[PDB]
Amino acid sequence: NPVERYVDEVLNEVLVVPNINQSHPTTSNAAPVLDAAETGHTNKIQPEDTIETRYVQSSQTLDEMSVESFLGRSGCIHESVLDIVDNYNDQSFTKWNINLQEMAQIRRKFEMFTYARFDSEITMVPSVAAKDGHIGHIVMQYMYVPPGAPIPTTRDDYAWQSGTNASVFWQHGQPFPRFSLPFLSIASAYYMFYDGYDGDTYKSRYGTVVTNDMGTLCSRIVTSEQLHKVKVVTRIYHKAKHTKAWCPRPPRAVQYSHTHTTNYKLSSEVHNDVAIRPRTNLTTV
Amino acid sequence: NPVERYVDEVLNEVLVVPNINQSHPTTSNAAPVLDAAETGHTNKIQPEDTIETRYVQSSQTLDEMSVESFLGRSGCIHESVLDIVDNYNDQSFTKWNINLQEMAQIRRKFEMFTYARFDSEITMVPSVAAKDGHIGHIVMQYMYVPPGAPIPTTRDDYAWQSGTNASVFWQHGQPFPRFSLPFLSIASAYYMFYDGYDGDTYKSRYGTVVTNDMGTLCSRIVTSEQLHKVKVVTRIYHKAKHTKAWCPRPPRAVQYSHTHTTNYKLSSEVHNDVAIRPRTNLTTV
Amino acid sequence: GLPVYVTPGSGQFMTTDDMQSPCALPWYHPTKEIFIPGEVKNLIEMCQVDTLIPINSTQS
C-alpha cells in the first residue's frame, strides 16, 4: 500500500534490521565459528551462534545508509572567482572545465564505487564582496557550454547570446539559483575509474579524462563596468539524485593531488601520509 | 491514455527510433544499394541491407530534435542601453524597431525554415551599472508601440500614459519581467524569407522588411533625475512556443551583415569566409 | 491571486533539503541503462564484508 509505504518514508523505517533471538547452550559437532577465509567468503556467523543471547526487538533502520542518502547531500565542487582588479573587460568573465574531482569531500564518496549513474542538482551561492564600498546592481550569467559549442573569448562575445545553450541569470538579492541535470553520459554509467587510454601509443592519455568530459561552465557579470570594483565568488554545490552505484571499492587512503588521476605523493615518513596512527606495540590499546 | 502520454513526456520518450533487425547473407538480383539520385529522392537503404546485422533494441528518442525543442530556447535578441552621460531628459529613454535579425545565434536557427508560426515568450534582464556609486531606486517602463501608435519624443511625452498600449513596469530588485505574445502576423505565418517587393519600381524595397514590421519598443527610466548617473542595459530574450515550421532550407554559411537581407561580404580569400577547412588533398583525412 | 504567507526558512539553501528544480536540459533522453554486475544499494552491504585489520601497525 503506497500509503503504508509513505508512512515508512516519513518515519524512515523502510529498511529494518533483524531481531536478535534467544539462544541456548550447545554441544555439537557443527562448529559455525570455524570456517575458511581462503574461499573469499565472509563467515556469516551471528551473535546467537557464539553466546547465549536474549530476545531483543530491533528498531534500527538502514534507510540513512542507502546509496541515495550517502550521495544525496549537496557539497561544494567548485569556487569560481571574478575579481575586478584593473581591467573590467578581462576580469568580468571566466570559464571552468567541469568535473567532480577538485574537492576531496564529495570526490572521495563517489570514488567508493567504480560506476555510478545519477541525475544532478546544482545550487549556486554567489557572494559579492564590496572591495571599494558599494556593489551596485549585480546580475550574473552562468552559461553551460557543451563540448563543441563556441567558448566566449570576451565579455561581449556573441556566444553569450545563448541561442541554444542553457544559461541561468541571477540578480543579486534574489534567492540562490538551482536547476537539475539528467544523467549526461554517452555510456550507461559514469566511470569513477577507467583503466584505459584514448589510443595505443606512448603519448595516449590514461584515466577518466578520456571518458569524463562534461564541457565548460562560462560565467560573466552581466552588468557593465561600475565605479566600485567587486569580487564575486560563486560556489557551486552538487547533489546526486536517483542514484545507482556498482562495484564498491576501498576508500582513498592518501590525499588527492590531481584531477582525473589516482596519483599521489609519499613523504619519507609514510605513516604521516595515511590516517593510521602508529601503535606502541601489539598489546597497547 | 493522457496519463501514459504524460509519462512519455516526463521520460522524453514520445518519439522512439526503430530497432535494428537481424539480417542474413543474400544472393539476389534485387540490389537495394543501387539507385538513381537523378530522381531527386534519397535511397532508403538501411544497415540491414548492406551487412549482416544483429538484433538491437533502440532506446533513443527524437523528442529533443523536435521543432518545438529546437526553437524553444530563450536567446538574446537585443541589448538596450540607457547611458546617462550629461543630459538626463535626452538619455533616459530610447526606442527600438523590433526584429529577430540582430543576433546571429537565434536568427540562424529560425532561418533554417521559410515560414514559421509561433507564440513568443519575452524575458528581460535589466542590469543597472552604478557609474557614480549609488543606484537609488530604479523603476523601468517598457512600452510596446504597435505600428501607427504615437512614438514618444521626450521622457515625459503623453504617449507614456499607455492608455491602450501594453506597458511593463519593473522595479529594481524584483524578479525579471516576462510576458507572452500571441502570433502577431496579419498573414498565416511569419515570412523568414520573402522574394518580393512593396511595389514595382526601381526604388521598391526588397525582402522581409516589407512584411515583418512588428512596431517599436520604447523604454524609459521612470525615476526622475538622480544625483548619481547610471547605465541601464536591458537584454531582451526571446523564445518560441507552440511552434510550426514550413519548407526547410540550407543554414546560413557566411556571416550576417544586415537585418532583413541575405546580403553578405566576401574577402579575396573566400575560404576564410566559410566554415569549410581546406583539405591538403583528397586522401588526407 | 491566492493569498500566501511566506514562512521562515524561505529562500535559504540547506545542503540536505529535498526539493524539486527545473531541468536545464528539457526533452533530453538519458542513455539506455544496461545491466552491470555488482550493484550496491545500501552501505550495509559493504559493512558485511571482511577486510583486514592493520593490527600490527607499529611505526616500523
Binding site: 500500500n1 | 516526463v10 | 531541468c23
Partner: peptide
Amino acid sequence: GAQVSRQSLNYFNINYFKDAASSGASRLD
C-alpha cells in the same frame, strides 16, 4: 504530476516539472 493515494490519509506525490531529473530524492529499495 500527482500520485493520489487514499487510506482518510491521502498522499499527493506531485511532480511539478515535466522532466524526471527534476523530482526529489528517490524512494528506497
